[PDB]
Amino acid sequence: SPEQAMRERSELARKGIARAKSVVALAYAGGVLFVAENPSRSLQKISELYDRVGFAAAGKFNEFDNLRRGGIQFADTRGYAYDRRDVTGRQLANVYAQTLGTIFTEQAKPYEVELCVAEVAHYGETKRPELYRITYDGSIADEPHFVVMGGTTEPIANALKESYAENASLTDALRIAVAALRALGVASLEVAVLDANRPRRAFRRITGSALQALL
């Protein structure tokens, strides 16, 4: 039956989401921190979307990567038509959800992906970081503190639940995030920030020797 088929599809999607590297995103004093478990040096699961909007994903690389590209596309055209400060994390979070739902209903296989869109305030302004999680069906959830995506999310989510502290510095939030992620080695870690203090482009990767010194 159709209902049975739908249930099977949901189970398949869940399985796909489960067998994947884990990513975390959490708010800290200077903005938002993305920490993903990533062995490759070329393939990335964290990306700039717009001036103050970042993006992390977990699942099947070609698909989440494809969404990455679609999201980049929409923001630039919108900004050119109206302006940079008009594109918000909210509008982008919304677009992905609608697209995912329609796509799943009309396509063959559902995207085994889990998305997190992050936004911080502009330069010289005060506002709390916003985290949204978009799931494979189109559901969207507003997160106040942290998002955990891919793999087994329960232990990481609980460890973060005990260790999280608002207004933690960059080093403390990195320790908390790596610790809860372990529930690792300097190599194979993809770390980036949405630094609210930057004048325009807030996204900034933290790689190599500096990262080693921090950890």
Binding site: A97, T135, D137, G138, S139, I140
Partner: peptide, 4 residues
């Protein structure tokens, strides 16, 4: 999901 996301019933409303």
């Amino acid at each position: 999901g996301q019933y409303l």
